Design a protein around this ligand. Sequence first.
Ligand SMILES: [Mn+2]
Ligand SMILES: [Mn+2]
Ligand SMILES: [Mn+2]
Ligand SMILES: [Zn+2]
Ligand SMILES: [Zn+2]
Ligand SMILES: [Zn+2]
Lengths: 512, 513, 500
Amino acid sequence: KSFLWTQSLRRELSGYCSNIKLQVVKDAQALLHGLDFSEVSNVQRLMRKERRDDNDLKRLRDLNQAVNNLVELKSTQQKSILRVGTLTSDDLLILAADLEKLKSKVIRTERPLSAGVYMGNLSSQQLDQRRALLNMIGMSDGVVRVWDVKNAELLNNQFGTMPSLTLACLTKQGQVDLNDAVQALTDLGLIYTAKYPNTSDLDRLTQSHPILNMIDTKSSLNISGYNFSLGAAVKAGACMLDGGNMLETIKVSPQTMDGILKSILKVKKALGMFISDTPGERNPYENILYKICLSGDGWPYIASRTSITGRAWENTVVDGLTYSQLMTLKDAMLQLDPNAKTWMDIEGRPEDPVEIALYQPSSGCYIHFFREPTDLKQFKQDAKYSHGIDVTDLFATQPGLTSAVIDALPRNMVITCQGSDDIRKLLESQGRKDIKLIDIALSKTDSRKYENAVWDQYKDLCHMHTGVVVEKKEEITPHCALMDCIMFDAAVSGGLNTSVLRAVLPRDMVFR
Amino acid sequence: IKSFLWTQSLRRELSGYCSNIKLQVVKDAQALLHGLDFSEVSNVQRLMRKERRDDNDLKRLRDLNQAVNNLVELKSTQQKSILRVGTLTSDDLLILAADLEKLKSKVIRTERPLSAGVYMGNLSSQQLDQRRALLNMIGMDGVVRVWDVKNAELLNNQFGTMPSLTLACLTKQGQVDLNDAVQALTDLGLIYTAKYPNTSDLDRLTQSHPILNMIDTKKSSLNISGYNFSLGAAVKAGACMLDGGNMLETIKVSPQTMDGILKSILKVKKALGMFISDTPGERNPYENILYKICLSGDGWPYIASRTSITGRAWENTVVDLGLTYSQLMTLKDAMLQLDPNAKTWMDIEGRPEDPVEIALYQPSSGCYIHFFREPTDLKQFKQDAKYSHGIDVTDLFATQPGLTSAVIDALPRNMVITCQGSDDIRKLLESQGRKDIKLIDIALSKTDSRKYENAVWDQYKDLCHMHTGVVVEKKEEITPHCALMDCIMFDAAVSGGLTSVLRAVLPRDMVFR
Amino acid sequence: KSFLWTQSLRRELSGYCSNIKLQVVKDAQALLHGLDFSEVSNVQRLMRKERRDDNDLKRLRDLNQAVNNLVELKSTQQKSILRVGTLTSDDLLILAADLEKLKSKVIRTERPLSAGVYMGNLSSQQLDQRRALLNMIGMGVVRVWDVKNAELLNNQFGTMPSLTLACLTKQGQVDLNDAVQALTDLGLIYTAKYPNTSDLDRLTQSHPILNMIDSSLNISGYNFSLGAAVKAGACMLNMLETIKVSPQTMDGILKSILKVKKALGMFISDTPGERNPYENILYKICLSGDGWPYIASRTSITGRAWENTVVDGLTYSQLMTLKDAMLQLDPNAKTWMDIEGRPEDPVEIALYQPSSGCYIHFFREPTDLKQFKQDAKYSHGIDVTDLFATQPGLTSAVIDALPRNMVITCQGSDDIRKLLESQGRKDIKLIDIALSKTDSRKYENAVWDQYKDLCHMHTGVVVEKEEITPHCALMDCIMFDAAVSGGLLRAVLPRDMVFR
Ligand SMILES: [Mn+2]
Ligand SMILES: [Mn+2]
Ligand SMILES: [Mn+2]
Ligand SMILES: [Zn+2]
Ligand SMILES: [Zn+2]
Ligand SMILES: [Zn+2]
C-alpha cells in the first residue's frame, strides 16, 4: 500500500517535520491581498485547452512568478553533492541507482506532453499500445502533444501544488471566508492522518463543509497548482494540523539533507519500497525522492518551487544503455513518423562512426548523437579532413546509443542519404538489413549550396565541431552529420525555410 | 491493533445487514429534544458521579430511561431466540454454546462486582494488590461496591449508549444547534472508517468543532451510562452519521436474519481467530457483537433503546443441540465478597459423605453461599427427605454439579467457621483437604436452636424453594430442615433476636443450570 | 562509558592488583620451551572451520590441558558461598539479581553456538531478526559446535597473556623481547584509552610482530585478537587484568565492584554479545574464589560463574533466554507432543522432533493433590516432593513461544487440544495418530534402554493387579514415533532453566 509507505515515512521522518500553519495562512493571506484571481481564472482556462502554445506558457510563468513574489515559503536554488559520511558507500550506490530509475519514470511520464507521440498511419497494435501510454500519462500531422513550445525547459517546475495557493484560490474562487476554507482543510487533513481520503469521504465532508465541493476527486498529471485536485486539497490540509508527522511539512537544509535521505533508505529497505518502471503517477517514494533532490534548501512538498531551474536528478548528484535508459529511448522514438521522408548521415567511417543523425524535414524532428571511435589513428585523420571533433570532447557522450537507436528504428522505414554505401554498411553491421535506402546523388557543389544558410540558422544545435578542417591546403567548414542532413534536404527542395527543429532524443541521453 | 482488524473484517462480512439510518437517528434525537426533561438528564449525571449509589438513585435512572424509551422509534423488542441446526450447522451451534458460556463469565465478572461488592478490608497486601487491580480494570464494613440495591436485576440493560440520546444531549446540554452536533459527529465517524478515533484525533477535531470538547476523552466504557459523554458514545453516534462504511452500529436483526448474522460472525471468527477473552474489563469487538446480537432477536443491537429488555444475552438467546473453567473463574471472583475475618456459620443437609445442600452465612454483612448436590446414596437420601430436608431428588436435577469441591476449595485460609454440632462440618471439610479451617461448636439445645424457626421462614422463605416433602418426627409433621434457614436461625438464637435484606454470594444461574 | 567503567574499576580495585610481568613472562618461557606449536597451529585450523565436532573439541581440550600443565598462573576449583557480613543484606540482593541477569545474557550469547538456530523455511522477518542475532554473537540449523556434551565447551576459550606472548614469539618468529616491547607499548596506550584500529596500525609501523593481530566472540586463547593483545600488554606494565582473588579477598572485591556500579550506574545488559566491563568482571570473579580471574589458565575449572558463586512464573531474564532457546525448533518438521497429568492440571510435558532429535521437556506442580495421587499410582509414578525442585511458569511461557501454525502429532489428540486451547493456541493443528495400546508401546523397553538417563522423575511403583513401567511424556513421544516408524537427542531447554 502506497499509504503504508507514507505512514512509514511519517514515523521515521517525524523529527524533520514542523508546525507550519501560521506560515501557510500568512502566505495565503498575501495571495488574497496581492494576486489577480482573474489571471488565476485565466490560467485555469488555458489548462483546460487540449493544445497549449508559448503564449499560454508565458501566462502560466508570469502568474507563477507573481505568486512566488508574494509568498515566504519558497525553495531556493541549491545544488547538493552527496559524499560518503552520514550516507554510506552502499547508500550512495542505492541512491544513484534510484535517481537513474526516477529520471526514466519522470521523463517517460512528462516529456511526451511536449515532445509528442506520433498517432497517424500505424498498425492496430502500435496505436493500441501508444493509446495505452497516452492514457496512463494524462494525455487525451498525426502527432499528439499538449505543449507546443520553442523551449520545453521552460515547462520545468511550473506545475507544483502549494498549500497557500490552494487555500487562497479556495477562499476567493469558492467565495467563502478564509476561516471556512481553513477548517474544511483541517477536517480533511485529520482524515489523512488515517487514510488516503477518497470520493466517498469527500462527499460526506462536503455535507458539513460545502467549500469542498470545488474539489475534483476523480489524477495529479497534466495539471497545475491552480487546479482543485484531491491531492492539492489533501496536501493543504496536512499543513493545517497541530502535529501529526505530516511528510508535507518537511523542511530540508544542507545540514539535514543527508540524514533525511538516510532515513528514507531505512524505510525503503524495511518495506521493499521501489521506483516504478512504469509511467504515470508517482508512488510515495518516487515522490519524496524527487521532491527532496530538487533542492537541499526549502520545503520539498509545499514551497513555491516555480523559480527553481533544473530537475531533481540534475540538482542532486552522487559523488551500454541500462534497462531504464532503453525504455526512455523507446518512448522518445514514438515521436518519429515512420512514413515520413527521413535523411540519415554520419561522420566517421561506417565501421567506426562517431556522429550520427537522422532528420525528418516535414515535422522537423531529428535524431543526433555521438560515439567514441575505436581506431584513434583514423579518427585524427577524419578530424583534420572531415569533422573537426576533438576526441576528448566525446568522453562526455553516452555510449551504446548506436545499436540502441538503430535497433529501435521503424520496420521498412525508407531512408534518404548522400553517402548511400556507408549508410547501408552501417545499418547491415547493426543487423538492420531490412531498411530501404534512397541514394540522392547530389554533386559536391550542389550538396553544399545551403551550407552557410544551414549553419547560420542552426549552429546552436551542435557544439562538437571545434577543429580546423582543411581540403588539399585551405580551411573549410567542418562536416556535421546533422547540418549535412539539413543542407541536403534544402538542396533537394531548392530552399531552406525558417523552422524550429525538435530533438527526438533527450539531451540527458546523448550526454552522460 | 488486533481489534480494529476484527471490526473491519466484521464490517465487510456483514455489509448486507448494515443500513442507512442517519435520518432515523437524527429524528429520534429531535423527539428527545422536544419531549425530554434535560434537567433530569443533568440529575442522572449527578447520580452517576457519586461513588456509592442506592435504590432511589436506581429508580431515577430507570424512570428517565423509560422516558427516553417512550419517545424514541429505534427500540429493541423483547424476543427470545432458540438456535437450532439449519442455517447454523451442528458444529456452529457448539461453537456458539462454548462462546456464550465464556461471554457470560467475562461479562458477570466485569459487571457483577459493581453491585455484589469486593471485600477490601483486613487482607494481606498481596490480596489487596490483586483485588485492587481487578477493581481498576472494571471501573470501580470493608466492602467496595457502586450500587447498594435491593434487587440487582433491576440494573440489567439500563446503561447502554444510544446515538439519538448522545445527539440530543450534546445539542441541548452543549447549547449548540443540532446541525453543529451532527456535523461534528460526521467529521468523527469518517476517522472511524480507518482507525479507532483517539484523544489526539478528538483534540484536533475540537479546534474545528468546539461541541466535541464535551466528550470526556479519559473515560472508560465501564461504570457509565447513556447520559455520559464518553468517546465510545460519540464514535458510535458518529458511525451512524455516515450512511456508509459498513458500520456495525447500523445493523438491524430480525427473527428471519439472526441465524445468518450469527453465521457471518462465525465465519469471521474462524479467519482471524477472534475469541472471547477471559479478562474482565472492556468488551473486544467479537464479545461486544455477540452480546449485543444475542440480547434480542428483534431490533438494533448497538443503537436502539434496550432499557425495556429483561434478561441477559445468554438468557435471551439459547442453543438447542462439574464446573467449566469459565464458571470456576466466575466463582473465584464471586467469593471475593466474603469477609474472611467475620463470623461465618455453616450447615449442611445430607450426611457428610453425601451432602445434598450447603450453606454459609456471614450475619454482619448479610452475605450467604447456598447450593445443592445430587445424592450418590439414594436409599439414605430417601430416609433424609422423610425425616429432615423434604427435598425431592428430581428437583436436584436442575442444580449445578461440582460446587461443593469448588466452593470449599475457594474458602479463605484460616477462616473461622461456626456451627451447631461440628462433627458433620469437620468430616465434610477434611474430605476436601481443608484441615486449616478452625471450627466453633455452638451447642444449642434442640429447643433453643429452633426458637426463631418460625420467624426466620416468615422473613426468608423466598430464598429457598427446594423443600417440598412432608417431613415428620416419630408421627407429627414438622417444618423441613434447610441448611440456609438453619444458619440464620441458629445465629438468631445466639443473638437473642432476628430484620435485614440478605445478599447471595453465588449468582442463581451458577447454582442452577 | 566502557572505558570509564574500566578506569573506575581500576581505582577501587588497586589494592588487589600487583605487577605480575615476571610471572607472565616465566609462564610464556615455559610454553615456548614446553608446548607443541604445530598443535597450536592445528587448533587454529580447527577454529577456522564453520562446523566443529567432538574430535575438534578433544584437540582443543587436550591442547588446553597441555598449556595448563606448563604454567603457574592457574586458577583452581573454588566454590564461593556469599553470606551476610562484609557484603550487606542489600549487597547480596543486588549481586543475586545481577548474576541472574548475567546468566541470561551469557547463555543467550554462547549457548546458540552448540544448541543451534533454525535458519530454514521461515518468514522474511524471522530470518532478518535471527540473522541480527547470529551476527551479534559472532555466528536448516546453524551451529558451530556439534558435540555430544556441551558442558565440555565450558571454560575452554579464555585468553591468557602468557599464551598470547608465547604464540606471538614462536608463530610470528620474533625474539621474546621484541613481543614484550611491542605488547608493552600497547599496554601504555591502554592506560588512557582502549587502543583502536588506528593505534595498532601506528604501532605496527615500528613493531612488526603486531601485524599478527586481526571480537572476543567465538574465538579461543590461540587466537590473535586485539583483546588478547591488550590484555597481555596490560600485564607488561592499576590494571584490572592483574587482580588476584582469594577466599579471604572475595567478599571485599565484590563490595568494591558494587560501589563502582552504584556510583556509575553500571548494569548487566539484556543484549547478547560482547560483555561490557561489568558483566566481564562479575563473570570472571565469580568463576573461582582462588586465582587470577582475567589472566590465569581457567581451562581445568568446571561450572559457570553463576554455579561457582552462590548467594546465601519466569523472571524477565529467563523469559528472554527461553524465547531464544525456542528458535532451535524447526516449525515445519514433524513434532510429537505428550503430557502426564490431566489437560487442566499437567505435571509433565514433552515435545520431540524426530528428524533433528531436539525435544522440549519440563514439569509443573499439581494443583489437585488428590487426583495427582491416582495418576501416580496408575500412570506417571512421580513423587510430588521431587517437583518442588522444578521451575514453575514454563507451561505458559513454552506454549506461548510455540511457532505459529504448527502441526503437532500426538496419541489421542483430545488432551493436547484442551491444553493448547486453554493457553490460547487455537492455530496449532493436531494429527491424532490412533495407535492401539499394544501397538503404541511396542518400543517401550527399547526407548527406555536408549534413553533412561534423560528423565529421573519416575520413582513410584505403577500398577494396572500387576507392576508396569511408569509413563513418561518424553519417552512416549519417542516410542510413539518409533511405532509409526517401524523402528527406533538435544534438549531445547537449558537444564538449569527446567529446574531451579
Ligand atoms: Mn556528412
Ligand atoms: Mn440443618
Ligand atoms: Mn503418555
Ligand atoms: Zn555535428
Ligand atoms: Zn433450603
Ligand atoms: Zn519423564
